[PDB]
Design a binder for this molecule. Structure first.
Ligand SMILES: NC(=O)c1ccc[n+]([C@@H]2O[C@H](COP(=O)([O-])OP(=O)(O)OC[C@H]3O[C@@H](n4cnc5c(N)ncnc54)[C@H](O)[C@@H]3O)[C@@H](O)[C@H]2O)c1
Ligand SMILES: NC(=O)c1ccc[n+]([C@@H]2O[C@H](COP(=O)([O-])OP(=O)(O)OC[C@H]3O[C@@H](n4cnc5c(N)ncnc54)[C@H](O)[C@@H]3O)[C@@H](O)[C@H]2O)c1
Lengths: 329, 329
């Protein structure tokens, strides 16, 4: 008789124990992600859903789950969940606004450094047993005296700026909403126009959501403006960049490197989503890739899961979930 | 007749044009490093030597070079130069106290983050073409909430601590000489003893020089104290650790990982150094290596050459050189 909650991926033992009194659990305690079908099947008369990165919820989905009251997302960017369609069908949609920030900021910064210093080739060369003593090659680019620019200055943007405080860089940024003047002053951050951002940054760090307006914002037009050698890092969504324009920009040698933790192929809500990452991109030596491990820190997963849990519980208790993304009664 | 100066490695054109007006230069504007035998032959009657990391200067070297008045080092770690022997024969020995610090500090943080997040493997996974989007695995270790222990707290250790300022980590160190109270509380650094450092740190960042006191300091004994999963980062000298001990600790699962820019094989002065990095260590998944690129940033390399050149010039003009390592009666 208790509400039914479908949890699409493994969560911690302790999280289940927190949910179990209040709802019956349709869980997936394995490593794999299940087909769309199998998940739709489970959700038919499900009253709650814990959704993770590979899930996409559209109107067709919601349509076949008439009893849903809350979809609790263990994530920040809800771009593959049609918020409106949720609101239309009376479904609460919740996110995790803070817990993913830091491990992701930490990673973005490591990518910057990894890319600026040719960490892949350097590591491969040492491993191939060919390294036999100090040599004047592998010249790299560090952050000291570099100008670093951010596209976006929300949670992840500020966590990055914070961590770059002691590093001797000129920090500058472009965003939709300006930062208050106190914060700018504190973090040594200068508000520039988007094209100046691309024209004058030695490192470009991406920190914005994927939505209608950001889709492919970082395109050939913007990449054309960059200092030869400029370094681009994408910790957020594959589709805010045009991967092909990024590839063309590396090939001509204008853009010095592209590191990324996210890919256009992950962005389900897009009708023309690439099925894979272009092999020519994987093959380009001036790159660095991680398979969406932005928040793949063990202690954090437990918290993220819990945040999503608590939200779900509140919804099912008839309260406004503390982290709803959308608005209802 | 102009004092004769032997440069053992390629230097920037600009550095030749500063030196040549004071000295007759015996240069090596090739890509190679030269034989000990060849360098001795050149130094037979030189009054100065500009030296780099492949150079090693013992008593027999000085004995074969009676005219030598200064050896100017394009580096910070003089472990391959016998200073007392230098002092004894009236030979200044200078070095470069700051130019190398920051690029090396940036690298070490990068290796820390890189190693913690399993970056080598992550990038392999993506590049293999079988990335199918996010998964509940690959999981790693962040700096937020971790304890980070430094062994050494001079130029480099401070730069690392500087660069960790906004990172949510508890910072500790053990040095041969304590930091002053102000710098301590400015950076949030607690002094602890060596063994306690290794027992209670999630990351251990090496930041000390190579000498008889520190040779093989990081040995089986010390490594047996670490929390399982602890991460070691060596950006200073290979031989401050026992690489076989490091390997064994990795192989038994106690040490979480090892990352280094330096290796026992490069430590020329060491009669018994291994001749290569152990293939079992290069094959170990829990590592990350860079081939001594600590200061491989072009803008900086020119500066390093300039620092040594000026030091060399001051000596020949009979001043005490600003960055002397010894002092002359
Ligand atoms: N790698 C990962 O695992 C991971 C983790 C967390 C978040 N992310 C992604 O990163 C995105 C942002 O993260 P956040 O926590 O900083 O989000 P946030 O909401 O805190 O910040 C979004 C920022 O981007 C700016 N922005 C929005 N639209 C813009 C536009 N058209 N032009 C310029 N700037 C614009 C906003 O003004 C805001 O500053 C998330 O939406 C998510 O998609 C990825
Ligand atoms: N990979 C590279 O390119 C690179 C670059 C610069 C320096 N290095 C190496 O790093 C070393 C240190 O660099 P630095 O600029 O910080 O030098 P530094 O002289 O400023 O710092 C040395 C620090 O180590 C501490 N120390 C010395 N003996 C110790 C012991 N027995 N136990 C604990 N602590 C001890 C000292 O007290 C001091 O704090 C250099 O000697 C050099 O060999 C490597």
């Amino acid at each position: 008789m208790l509400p039914k909650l479908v949890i699409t991926h493994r969560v911690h033992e302790e999280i289940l124990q927190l949910l179990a009194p209040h709802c019956e659990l349709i869980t997936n305690q394995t490593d794999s992600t299940l087909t769309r079908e199998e998940i739709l099947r489970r959700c038919r008369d499900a009253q709650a859903m814990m959704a993770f990165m590979p899930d996409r919820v559209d109107a067709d989905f919601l349509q076949a789950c008439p009893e849903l009251r809350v979809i609790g997302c263990a994530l920040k960017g809800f771009d593959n969940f049609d918020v409106d369609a949720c609101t239309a069908r009376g479904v609460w949609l919740t996110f995790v606004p803070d817990l993913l920030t830091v491990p992701t900021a930490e990673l973005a910064i490591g990518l910057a450094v990894g890319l600026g210093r040719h960490l892949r080739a350097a590591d491969a060369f040492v491993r191939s047993g060919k390294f036999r003593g100090w040599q004047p090659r592998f010249y790299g680019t560090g952050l000291d005296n570099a100008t670093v620019g951010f596209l976006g200055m929300g949670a992840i943007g500020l966590a990055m700026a914070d961590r770059l405080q002691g590093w001797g860089a000129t920090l500058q940024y472009h965003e939709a909403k300006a930062l208050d003047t106190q914060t700018e002053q504190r973090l040594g951050l200068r508000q520039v126009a988007c094209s100046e951002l691309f024209a004058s940054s030695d490192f470009i760090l991406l920190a914005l959501p994927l939505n209608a307006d950001t889709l492919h914002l970082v395109n050939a037009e913007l990449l054309a403006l960059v200092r030869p050698g400029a370094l681009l890092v994408n910790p957020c969504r594959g589709s805010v960049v045009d991967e092909a324009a990024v590839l063309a920009a590396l090939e001509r040698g204008q853009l010095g490197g592209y590191a990324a933790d996210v890919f256009e192929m992950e962005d389900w809500a897009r009708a023309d989503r690439p099925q894979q990452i272009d092999p020519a991109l994987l093959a380009h030596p001036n790159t660095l890739f991680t398979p969406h491990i932005g928040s793949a820190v063990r202690a954090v997963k437990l918290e993220i899961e819990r945040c999503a849990a608590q939200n779900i519980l509140q919804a099912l208790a008839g309260e406004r979930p503390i982290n709803a993304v959308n608005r209802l009664p």
